[PDB]
Amino acid sequence: TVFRQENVDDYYDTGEELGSGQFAVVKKCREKSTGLQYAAKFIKKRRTKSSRRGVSREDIEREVSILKEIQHPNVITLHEVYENKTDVILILELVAGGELFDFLAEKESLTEEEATEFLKQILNGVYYLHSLQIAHFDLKPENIMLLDRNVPKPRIKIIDFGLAHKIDFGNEFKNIFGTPEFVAPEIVNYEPLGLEADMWSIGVITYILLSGASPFLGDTKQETLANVSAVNYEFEDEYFSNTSALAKDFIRRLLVKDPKKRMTIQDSLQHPWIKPKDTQQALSRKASAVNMEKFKKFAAR
Ligand SMILES: Nc1ncnc2c1ncn2[C@@H]1O[C@H](COP(=O)(O)OP(=O)(O)O)[C@@H](O)[C@H]1O
Ligand SMILES: [Mg+2]
Question: Does domain 1-96 have CATH number 3.30.460.40?
Answer without folding.
Answer: no
